[PDB]
Design a protein around this ligand. Structure first.
Ligand SMILES: O=c1ccn([C@@H]2O[C@H](CO)[C@@H](O)[C@H]2O)c(=O)[nH]1
Ligand SMILES: O=c1ccn([C@@H]2O[C@H](CO)[C@@H](O)[C@H]2O)c(=O)[nH]1
Ligand SMILES: [K+]
Ligand SMILES: [K+]
Lengths: 302, 302
């Protein structure tokens, strides 16, 4: 009865492209994918074999319930997700071409994931092996999670350069943070011009009380640092990338899962990279052939 | 046990706008509305009080099942709508601004609404008081409907200038056609420069065997013509137009419904205009306050 709790946003990604110029109902292709950092992480966790509870918010509309249902049949326990009356399920609209042209995000239902709401599941949350939170939620909600985790490790996904900042004053309450270059720069106030500067950035994070840093630098690789002194680089699992979406979602899932499985820091980072790689090689936001098995086959094939 | 059968397309309309410039996830607002000419006509018919069966196609995805469910709880009988495996539910994506910027339509599952499919409901179709078909379906499918209607009146919505053409050779099999200016011009090969040319256009339609013509000219009004000699104009119900979508859908519903209610042609046209007016004054694709009562109140306020 070990379970993982993911507190994040549940979205519908809608992607459309043509086969193009404006003020015209132009023929093309549209796809509805299930999305949202929290939701995607929960799903990757279920595909990794953990029993994952999603604490998110969808609307009273029917498409919310289709998001929930689709998520549930992926192995995720969505029966505490909040259904909000009157308001609409959040979404990520994305206009492409044969390659993004533009994108809209409507994610205000994330503000419904309140302190009140999580407080009604305090005990349940405090009896998880691991809590994973994304920064789509309000500052009040993230503060509540970090203040009432009862020594349950909180893994935090910073999401964006804009949304990561709510983490700055609470690095001492976070077990593992996984920022990208821009996010780390935005948090520390130190430029990540090159591979020379990861040390000062990590040192900044550790002096502000961050237990573990998992820093994705892109092509440079992943730099990981433990406040107890262990640090290192891991070079990318070089891959045939079709779409990049769900990469970080998969990596977060890998980190939390490996932690729950008793794996060491470095090897958990390598495994997580394998996961994100599987994500990079799938047209969909989450890969339904993500497994401990073929992630390990992607890793031993190093 | 009188029922109405609607054979058309079932879509999800997605509308997104900002608070906008490119290569950026712009915070904004997204709405999923149920749509598709056929589906909307069925819904307006249910709100007009008829018991309406929808023969459409949605995908094996979950959002299809949500389209069906929302439509069913709007009062429509969707239990013969086809759920197609492997392929995804069709949709009308719309990028707006505070004013449409661009639109994509993905409507290829409409080609799954086959002759085989309708033939498996031959009996049921042939025992309706009226059949309503849209030109989103294939030429083979429309030809099958018109060839096996068993003297059940077929009301046809032409949909677009591009899609209306499949109606040209089968006007003698159609009870009532409702084209716009552009559609009538495209069908007849006669220019509708002004209100002078409605007579020649209508005469062209009647010599090609069309029983009834309901011609919407926009601000000019609605010109209606019976192959038996009755014709006339009806001036628009001037309204507070918020968005225009679902106008013609509402009008078609009004026409079919009024026909089923034994109403005369002209008064059915006036009533139908009232319906479209209710639609014009609702932000949504279908107005849930469309009713015999308050449309008739929109008409008596003439
Ligand atoms: O602020 C944002 C932007 C995107 N996403 C989600 O992240 C995924 C892309 O990695 C998609 O599911 C998208 O909905 C969020 O959760 N928050
Ligand atoms: O070829 C098309 C284009 C649009 N629509 C639908 O018609 C409505 C607008 O009148 C919307 O629901 C839209 O999805 C169709 O059914 N077919
Ligand atoms: K992916
Ligand atoms: K409308």
């Amino acid at each position: 009865k070990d379970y993982v709790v993911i507190i994040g946003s549940a979205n519908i990604d809608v992607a459309g492209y043509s086969h193009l110029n404006y003020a015209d109902s132009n023929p093309g292709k549209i796809k509805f994918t299930p999305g949202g950092v929290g939701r995607n992480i929960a799903q990757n966790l279920a595909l990794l074999g953990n029993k994952a509870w999603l604490l998110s918010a969808v609307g009273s509309d029917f498409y919310g319930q289709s998001l929930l249902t689709q998520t549930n049949q992926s192995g995720v326990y969505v029966d505490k997700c909040l259904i909000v009356p009157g308001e609409n399920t959040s979404s990520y609209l994305s206009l492409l071409d044969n390659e993004m042209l533009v994108a809209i995000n409507d994610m205000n239902i994330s503000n419904a994931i309140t302190a009140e709401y999580l407080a009604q599941h305090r005990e349940f949350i405090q009896r998880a092996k691991v809590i994973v939170a994304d920064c789509n939620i309000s500052e009040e909600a993230l503060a509540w999670i970090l203040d009432n985790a009862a020594n349950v490790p909180v893994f935090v996904d910073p999401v964006s350069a804009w949304k990561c900042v709510k983490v700055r004053d609470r690095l001492n309450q976070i077990h593992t943070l996984k920022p990208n270059r821009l996010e780390a720069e935005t948090l520390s106030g130190i430029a990540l011009s090159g591979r020379d500067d990861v040390a000062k950035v990590a040192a900044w994070f550790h002096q502000h009380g961050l237990n573990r840093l998992v820093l994705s630098m892109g092509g440079d690789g992943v730099y990981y640092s433990d406040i107890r002194g262990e640090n290192g680089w891991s070079a990318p699992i070089k891959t045939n990338v079709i779409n990049v979406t769900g990469a970080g979602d998969a990596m977060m899932a890998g980190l939390a899962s490996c932690w729950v499985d008793g794996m060491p820091f470095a090897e958990s980072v390598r495994f997580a990279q394998g996961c994100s790689s599987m994500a990079l090689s799938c047209e969909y936001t989450n890969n339904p052939d993500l497994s401990i098995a073929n992630v390990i086959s992607l890793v031993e094939n190093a």
